[PDB]
Each structure stands twice: as C-alpha cells, then as structure tokens.
Amino acid sequence: NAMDRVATARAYYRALDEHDYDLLSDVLAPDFVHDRPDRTIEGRERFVRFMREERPQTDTSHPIATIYTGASTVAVEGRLLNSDGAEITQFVDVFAFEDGVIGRIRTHTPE
Amino acid sequence: NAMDRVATARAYYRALDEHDYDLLSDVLAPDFVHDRPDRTIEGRERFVRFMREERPQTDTSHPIATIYTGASTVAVEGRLLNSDGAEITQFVDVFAFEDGVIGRIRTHTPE
Ligand SMILES: C[As](C)(=O)[O-]
Ligand SMILES: C[As](C)(=O)[O-]
Ligand SMILES: [Br-]
Ligand SMILES: [Br-]
Ligand SMILES: [Br-]
Ligand SMILES: [Br-]
Ligand SMILES: [Br-]
Ligand SMILES: [Br-]
Ligand SMILES: [Br-]
Ligand SMILES: [Br-]
Ligand SMILES: [Br-]
Ligand SMILES: [Br-]
Ligand SMILES: [Br-]
Ligand SMILES: [Br-]
Ligand SMILES: [Br-]
Ligand SMILES: [Br-]
Ligand SMILES: [Br-]
Ligand SMILES: [Br-]
Ligand SMILES: [Br-]
Ligand SMILES: [Br-]
Ligand SMILES: [Br-]
Ligand SMILES: [Br-]
Ligand SMILES: [Br-]
Ligand SMILES: [Br-]
Ligand SMILES: [Br-]
Ligand SMILES: [Br-]
Ligand SMILES: [Br-]
Ligand SMILES: [Br-]
Ligand SMILES: [Br-]
Ligand SMILES: [Br-]
Ligand SMILES: [Br-]
C-alpha cells in the first residue's frame, strides 16, 4: 500500500525530530540498515542507540520538500536544518520496505 | 568511484535522449532492472528493445536538476519534458551499480 509506505516514511522523520525512540523502533525492521556517504549502520537496535547517543551533537530538523513514490520504494527530498532554521544540506532518502516497515534507507547528498 | 557512478548515470540519460542504444546497452548490466510505478522491465536486452520500440510514442527530454550521491547509489532529480519543453513530471531515479555499470533504476514520481 503506497499510502501506508508514505505515512511510514513521514513517521520516521517525526520520530527522529521528536526523539520518539519507541515510534522510531516501531517503523523499522529488525535488520534495518541506514546507508549514508560517511557510514553504514546495520541493525535496528544499533541504529536507535546511535540516534539517541548522537542527539546532543546537533539540533536539526528534517522538513520534507517533496515525497516521490515508486513501485515499491519511496524517495523523500528534504532539507536538513540547524537549530536556527538555516539549511545545512539538501538530501534525498530512499526507503525500501519489508512487511510494512522500513528495511533500508539510503541517504544521498548533492554532488 | 563516485565520480564514475555519476558519469555513468549522466550517460544513461544522454543515451535515452539521443537514442544511442549502443551507449545505453553499454552502461547497463545484463540483468538490469528498471522499476517505475506502472511497470517493471527485467533484462538489459528487453529494456533496450522497449526503449527502441516505444520511441515514437512521445518526444521527451530528461534534463537533470540535481544529482545526489550516496555511499554506493546515486539519486537523480530531474524533469521529464515534452517536445515543446513543457514539464510533464518531476522524478527521482535511484541508480544501483554492479561492477561499474547500472544494475537497477527505481523511478519515483511525486505523490
Ligand atoms: C535523533 As538525532 C538526528 O538528534 O541523533
Ligand atoms: C528512448 As524513448 C524514452 O524515446 O522510448
Ligand atoms: Br501520509
Ligand atoms: Br508528520
Ligand atoms: Br504516534
Ligand atoms: Br546514520
Ligand atoms: Br554523510
Ligand atoms: Br561504515
Ligand atoms: Br561513526
Ligand atoms: Br553497523
Ligand atoms: Br532498543
Ligand atoms: Br538505546
Ligand atoms: Br540534547
Ligand atoms: Br515535514
Ligand atoms: Br544544529
Ligand atoms: Br510495504
Ligand atoms: Br559527470
Ligand atoms: Br551528459
Ligand atoms: Br560516447
Ligand atoms: Br520503463
Ligand atoms: Br510510472
Ligand atoms: Br510489470
Ligand atoms: Br507495458
Ligand atoms: Br520484464
Ligand atoms: Br540488443
Ligand atoms: Br532492440
Ligand atoms: Br520517432
Ligand atoms: Br542534463
Ligand atoms: Br511529448
Ligand atoms: Br534503492
Ligand atoms: Br560502482
């Protein structure tokens, strides 16, 4: 269900921005992998710990610009904002799903 | 090599827009899959045939707006233009690679 996938992607960003780790855990598959240019984190429990432990390092928001739906994946184009509301970077996150929850996110940043 | 991956993604759109099927074949893995919301095409030879046979159905261009690089994939945000230069749709294509050539493209269109 494409509506459900989009809702789940939006819930992911809500959980990150609200520090709602129970919601975050609940939208991820156990074997969730997050890829970004600088690193890969494998495992839901490991990822949630990293997010919690890294919280004080910045005070950012992930406002969504446009959501693009594919056949079975979702690509979200957003902006990463600092605490003042200034744009750090543009991004595209691509979400793949496993039984209704997120199996992988691949983060891309502009060349 | 991230430079090489970006060059290869750009070559894909050049090949489509120029109808250079030899270049198109050369940037794709044999087992290339193209996913879009309406259909999936599996196989390089099959895909090249579809592109060739579908050529007369529209007269579009794939100008690239922004290229986003990930750890191992590339996300291209572009516009699909008609022959008059008017925008049909915005898209994000996500490219995965296999030995330097493209293994999969997942096309996403705005919700
Ligand atoms: C959940 As966070 C991006 O403040 O480490
Ligand atoms: C290569 As075409 C998009 O004209 O079928
Ligand atoms: Br929604
Ligand atoms: Br929301
Ligand atoms: Br909730
Ligand atoms: Br991460
Ligand atoms: Br990064
Ligand atoms: Br890593
Ligand atoms: Br790290
Ligand atoms: Br890891
Ligand atoms: Br936990
Ligand atoms: Br934790
Ligand atoms: Br904090
Ligand atoms: Br938002
Ligand atoms: Br910040
Ligand atoms: Br799903
Ligand atoms: Br290039
Ligand atoms: Br080009
Ligand atoms: Br050439
Ligand atoms: Br296609
Ligand atoms: Br489509
Ligand atoms: Br199909
Ligand atoms: Br068809
Ligand atoms: Br097929
Ligand atoms: Br052929
Ligand atoms: Br052919
Ligand atoms: Br034609
Ligand atoms: Br271009
Ligand atoms: Br057209
Ligand atoms: Br992907
Ligand atoms: Br590669």
Closest ligand (CA of A41): 10
The Cα B104–Cα B95 span in angstroms is 6
Select the residue of B40, B69, B77 nearest A71 (Cβ to Cβ): B40
Ligand 24 ion local residues (Cβ < 5 A): B 41-42
A80 Cβ below 6 A of ligand 1? no
User: Method used for this model?
Assistant: X-ray
Q: How many angstroms away from the CA of A35 is the closest CA of chain B?
A: 7
DSSP output for chain A: -HHHHHHHHHHHHHHHHHT-HHHHHHTEEEEEEEEETTEEEE-HHHHHHHHHHHGGG---B--EEEEEE-SSEEEEEEEEE-TTS-EEEEEEEEEEEETTEEEEEEEEEE-
- Backbone region of residue B100 per phi and psi (left: phi > 0; alpha: psi in -120 to 50; beta: other values): left
Resolution (A): 1.6
User: Chain B interface, mutation test: which of A39, A67, A106, A107, most B Cβ atoms within 10 Å?
Assistant: A106
CB pair distance less than 8 Å for B75 and A67: no
**Token pair of A18 as six digits:** 């609200």
The hierarchical CATH code for the domain A1-111 is 3.10.450.50
CB within 8 Å of B21: residues ≥ 6 apart: B15, B48, B51, B52
